[PDB]
Design a protein around this nucleic acid. Structure first.
Ligand SMILES: [Mg+2]
Ligand SMILES: [Mg+2]
Ligand SMILES: [Mg+2]
Ligand SMILES: [Mg+2]
Ligand SMILES: [Mg+2]
Ligand SMILES: [Mg+2]
Ligand SMILES: [Mg+2]
Ligand SMILES: [Mg+2]
Ligand SMILES: [Mg+2]
Lengths: 159, 170, 213, 292, 75
RNA sequence: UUUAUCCGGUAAAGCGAAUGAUUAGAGGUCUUGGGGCCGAAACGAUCUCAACCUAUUCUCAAACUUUAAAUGGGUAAGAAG
RNA sequence: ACAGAAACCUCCCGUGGAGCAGAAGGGCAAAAGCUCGCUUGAUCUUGAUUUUCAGUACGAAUACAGACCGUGAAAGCGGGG
RNA sequence: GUCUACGGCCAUACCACCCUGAACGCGCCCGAUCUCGUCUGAUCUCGGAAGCUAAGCAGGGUCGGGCCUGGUUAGUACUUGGAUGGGAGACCGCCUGGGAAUACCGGGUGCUGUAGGCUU
RNA sequence: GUUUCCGUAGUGUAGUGGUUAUCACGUUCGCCUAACACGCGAAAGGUCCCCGGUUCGAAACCGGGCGGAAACACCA
């Protein structure tokens, strides 16, 4: 049986990666968070105040609070079955804007735009995504070569 | 023809070590006071040493830094005792030099039978205009490649002003 | 003395390097992973004969000793005392363990059976993967047979199975033998006692200026 | 010999500082605590008045901080001050006033506030601290940035501040460092700030030096002689400035177009031109010593 | 009298049989948890809304008759 | 199951990237030594062995790691938009 | 200088090899390393959350809010370490 | 072209050395009447402006170390699933997918954010 | 094997809390003795077992070991 301590097994998570040991680049606490915005937690050594903890190092959740230097944030955590949507109070330093949503938004802005246009036509445009179809009949061509002959090559023992 | 690479004395350092504390030290402070005209700083022990009779954070030496003309006026009246002659291995790898004396009286000083004879270490930091680039706070930096006083430039410094022989052989 | 190699033949456990974590390790049996004329040159000594493992196993330190010695004995004869180099390339080094022998007196009364099962240091062993070299030798090109058989005898101090192979490199370098005389005569490669320095079209030009000078 | 400290290893592992550090210009921790705006605000900025006295010219500028790089709303330097009848001695604590005052009013001409929160006018050298008027645009504010100046009493920085405060910005300033604070008592004279603001430091140096010796005058301050500036006068240049600044703060630029546009740096050498120089040598060398 | 000292064996089977329900999230979740100085305030926002309904209603009908006129001017 | 997007430090690798072990030679009065041998003695000659370190090379690490997979874990893929 | 592998001083190098009451582990540089001035944010008070989880206690922590204050030119920072 | 002030991302920026600075600044500099700070005006503060790019910085250079990409190693190592595959056993073979790292070769060497100069 | 205990002058043995080391004996030198004993005056002698750590500092406080000792090893 092991020790429950909040920061076991974090030796090599919270550890800052390389050659970044030092002053936290300021940008990372001068971008604005606001409720609804989805955020990825990512624990950090340097600052220890307002740390998350390992069982959500590397999760995402939406923001529900904004305090002076922290962001209350709702994340789902699995626990012998019942998943619990649960709320923590993590200091900004350990948080980013997940670009997860940001494929959609750019896909929305395009679909509303492509629907408002081609309405003055009335032509039906393919709005939905669609998985990678089977690659279509094409031809190939060699021009003035036959293709190159492979032979499997004889084994000799290298060492 | 050089613009302002006036090889010139940034400072003169006087240390008087005497692994004792109390008197035999407190009196040594008056020698530097007298010689220089500025209240010298008491040094203290880095840490305890047994064969020596010194203990961590015990006072040992007393030391000063003298600068401007009054450096010139104690380097001169310093070497004089060493009759304008030094050795090859005091002209150091960073263009500083060092000459020690044996007895504080020889520098135009009065002996009291109480206040004995503690010589001192004289050393001097040769500089040049724009050597404070390092020591400042804003926009600090390093002092070039040249602009650094080599051993041999510090040699024929001392050989063309105090005109000493600088005798070879260790 | 020790259980027969059998019982520590196979790598089951994670490497136990002698370190802070285990201590009181009896010093490795083997000590010289090269003998002969280690004062040789690359240019006079052209035959990197090799002994290579064919199995994922552990080799005892005391096997390596024997394996070496019996190759120093056959070479010498063969070539003479000056006429080779032998290199062993497995310094035993993960540490092997022994529960402390289940010691009891006479009929006995209590051993405790399994409590504190964890043993002590007994000795030392090598990890060995397949196609990995154990011993190597160099001689003259002349004297191939006299390497072959020396490693051949060494195989018999030595569990599992393992091929003897002759290399394509200048002796002990990594540089493919068909190619030195050229690569030296033009100085891609510069002599350096046993080994050789590969010198590339990289560093400052005054480094080159010294050669072709 | 020794061990080479600066190995390959030295440079594989050496992790650079953090640019404006190497150059040695910026508290950032402290830029951290100055700049970054609380997140019960999300967008709204945090203004700081930036003063660094250079060496020849005092620069003052209000800046707010965005993720691309702090944006400057207004900037007022010392070398503008010839416009306002101050020719010289313009890295001097009393000119940091005029500069900081300038800044406050060049700012307050925008967002239309030159008709309100003027601050103090005649100038005392006291607590002036702006109080925002109700039913109007509430006053402007910024948290002074010293940079790296050991902010002892008397230093120009939090002295230029006095200018921008006097000029109608609502900076939190205390008075513990204005030239005049007695560090064995803990008050003002304030009538020392009188002087210290209007340059009767420099007047009374321009008068201790003159009656003792000539030609230390002239050496120590030639341009104080030239331009027909004197003591007595001094006090009543500056008073024309904190008036002249305040009737017109606005910058007019100077329009700029001419330059021919020659390139009198040196350019990067192209690949092939390094590629040969080694092939150009080594043919200069080979040839040379296939001979002698 | 020794025994087993854990396992997490069939298990996956159980805390999974009935499902693992990703928590059913309503719109309009609770504001409990939020800094009191928000709520302290947004309740003064919420309370003094009706003060300013006369504007709201007239200003609605302005936009409604302007957009009854926009859709009728299209007609 | 896809497509975005984070998260992740295991296998492998490396150790001519840090730490830790470790072989070997070239190299070095680096230092210095302790023994020689030729030297009164002499960085004098020549040896020798210590230690260090300048280019190298052998081989390794669960309580190492520059790199660094496979398998894996969050979100997101809209009317509550 | 006395002063010697070690006192004292001064220059240069010095990514971190120190240091940061302790096991390690993570963290740290015009800092969180060291020196001094000023002090009581180790103070009074509701609530929310994390961690151990049944998601019960205790302990320990995180975010806020209300008082009253230290410090600092000030931004903040500070409810023990 | 370039600089200063404040900057973003933090080495394509570092380091080591070599070369050149027109103007403005940026610097070096000169002094201690005051403020202020020291053992020392060595650093900080302040008042300056008699010099020179000596250095920083800036601008450039090196078959330069480093960092950053590409290639190669290599479809190698390793691996998801797979079999009533082999093998006394270690281990090894295949099928279905995924697929690294060094040595060794190449190329590059900081991009720009606002405010303000100078080259009118 | 597991649990205890020691190690300090030539020997037997004290000692402290982290500044300092003893006694007795032994022995070297005088004296007394015709000469030995005894008696009286002077004297010199260990890394405080070997280590690494902490600390201003360790003989003494941790951790490891090495040498000498003691004590258990019960139901069948
Ligand atoms: Mg500060
Ligand atoms: Mg792990
Ligand atoms: Mg500080
Ligand atoms: Mg409070
Ligand atoms: Mg000065
Ligand atoms: Mg220059
Ligand atoms: Mg120059
Ligand atoms: Mg390079
Ligand atoms: Mg099956």
């Amino acid at each position: 049986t092991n020790t429950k301590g909040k920061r076991r097994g974090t030796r090599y998570m919270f550890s800052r990666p390389f050659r970044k040991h030092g002053v936290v680049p300021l940008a990372t606490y001068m971008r604005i968070y606001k409720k609804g915005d989805i955020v990825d937690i990512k624990g950090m050594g340097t600052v220890q105040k307002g740390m998350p903890h390992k069982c959500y190092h590397g999760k995402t959740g939406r923001v529900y609070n904004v305090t002076q230097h922290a962001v209350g944030i709702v994340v789902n955590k699995q626990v012998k079955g019942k998943i619990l949507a649960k709320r923590i109070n993590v200091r900004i330093e350990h948080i980013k804007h997940s670009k997860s949503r940001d494929s959609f938004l750019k896909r929305v802005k395009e679909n509303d735009q492509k629907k408002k246009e081609a309405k003055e036509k009335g032509t039906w445009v393919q709005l939905k995504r669609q998985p990678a179809p089977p690659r279509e009949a094409h031809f190939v061509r060699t021009n003035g070569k036959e293709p190159e002959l492979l032979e499997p090559i004889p084994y000799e023992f290298m060492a | 023809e050089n613009p302002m690479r006036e090889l010139r004395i940034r400072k003169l350092c006087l240390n008087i070590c005497v692994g004792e504390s109390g008197d035999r030290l407190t009196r040594a402070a008056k020698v530097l006071e007298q010689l220089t005209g500025q209240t010298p700083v008491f040094s203290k022990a880095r840490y305890t040493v047994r064969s020596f009779g010194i203990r961590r954070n015990e006072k040992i030496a007393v030391h000063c830094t003298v600068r401007g003309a009054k450096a010139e006026e104690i380097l001169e009246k310093g070497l004089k005792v060493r009759e304008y002659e030094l050795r090859k291995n005091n002209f150091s790898d960073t263009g500083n030099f060092g000459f020690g004396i044996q007895e504080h009286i020889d520098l135009g000083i009065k002996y009291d039978p109480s206040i004995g004879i503690y010589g001192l270490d004289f050393y001097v930091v040769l500089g040049r205009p724009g050597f404070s680039i390092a020591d400042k706070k804003r926009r600090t930096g390093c002092i070039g490649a040249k602009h650094r006083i080599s051993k041999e430039e510090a040699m024929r410094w001392f050989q063309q002003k105090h005109d000493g022989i600088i005798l070879p052989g260790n | 003395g020790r259980r027969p190699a059998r019982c520590y033949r196979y790598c089951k456990n994670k490497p136990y390097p002698k370190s802070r974590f285990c201590r009181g390790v009896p010093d490795a049996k083997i000590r010289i992973f090269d003998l002969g004329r280690k004062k040789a040159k690359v240019d006079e000594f052209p035959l990197g004969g090799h002994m290579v493992s064919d199995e994922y196993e552990q080799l005892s330190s005391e096997a390596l000793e024997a394996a070496r010695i019996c190759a120093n004995k056959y070479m010498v004869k063969s070539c003479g005392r000056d006429g080779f180099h032998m290199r062993v390339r497995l310094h035993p080094f993960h540490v092997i363990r022994i529960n402390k022998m289940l010691s009891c007196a006479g009929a006995d009364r209590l051993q405790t059976g399994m409590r504190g099962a964890f043993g002590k240091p007994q000795g030392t062993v090598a990890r060995v993967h397949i196609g990995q070299v154990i011993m190597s030798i160099r001689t003259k090109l002349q004297n191939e047979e006299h390497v072959i058989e020396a490693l051949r005898r060494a195989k018999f101090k030595f569990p599992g199975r393992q091929k003897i192979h002759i290399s394509k490199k200048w002796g002990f370098t990594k540089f493919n033998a068909d190619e030195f005389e050229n690569m030296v005569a033009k100085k891609c490669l510069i002599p350096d006692g046993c080994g050789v320095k590969y010198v590339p079209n990289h560093g400052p030009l005054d480094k080159w200026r010294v050669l072709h000078s | 010999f020794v061990k080479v400290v600066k190995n390959k290893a030295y440079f594989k592992r050496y992790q650079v500082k953090f640019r404006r550090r190497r150059e040695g210009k910026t508290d950032y921790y402290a830029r951290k605590r100055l700049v970054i705006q609380d997140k019960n605000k999300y967008n709204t900025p945090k203004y700081r008045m930036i003063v660094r006295v250079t060496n020849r010219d005092i620069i003052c500028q209000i800046a707010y901080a965005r993720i691309e790089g702090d944006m400057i709303v207004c900037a007022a330097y010392a070398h503008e001050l010839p416009k306002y009848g101050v020719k010289v001695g313009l890295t001097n604590y009393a000119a940091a006033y005029c500069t900081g005052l300038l800044l406050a009013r060049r700012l307050l001409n925008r967002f239309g506030m030159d008709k309100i929160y003027e601050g103090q006018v005649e100038v005392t050298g006291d607590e002036y601290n702006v109080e925002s008027i109700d039913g109007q645009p509430g006053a402007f504010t910024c948290y002074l940035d010293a940079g790296l100046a050991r902010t002892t009493t008397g230093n120009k920085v939090f002295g230029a501040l006095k200018g921008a405060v006097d000029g109608g910005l609502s900076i939190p300033h205390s008075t513990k460092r204005f030239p005049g604070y007695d560090s064995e008592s803990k008050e003002f004279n304030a009538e020392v700030h009188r002087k210290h603001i209007l340059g009767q430091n420099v007047a009374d140096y321009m008068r201790y030096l003159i009656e003792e010796d000539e030609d230390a005058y002239k050496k120590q301050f030639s341009q104080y002689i030239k331009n027909n500036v004197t003591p007595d006068m001094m006090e009543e240049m500056y008073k024309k400035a904190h008036a002249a600044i305040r009737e017109n703060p606005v910058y007019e630029k100077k329009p700029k177009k001419e330059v021919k546009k020659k390139r009198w740096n040196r350019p990067k050498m192209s690949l092939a031109q390094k590629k040969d120089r080694v092939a150009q040598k080594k043919a200069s060398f080979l040839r040379a010593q296939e001979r002698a | 009298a020794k025994s087993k000292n854990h396992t997490t064996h069939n298990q996956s089977r159980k805390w999974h049989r009935n499902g693992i329900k990703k928590p059913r999230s309503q719109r309009y979740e609770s504001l409990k948890g939020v800094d009191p100085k928000f709520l302290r305030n947004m309740r003064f926002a919420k309370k003094h809304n009706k003060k300013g309904l006369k504007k709201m209603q007239a200003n609605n009908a302005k936009a409604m008759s302007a957009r009854a006129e926009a859709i009728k001017a299209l007609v």
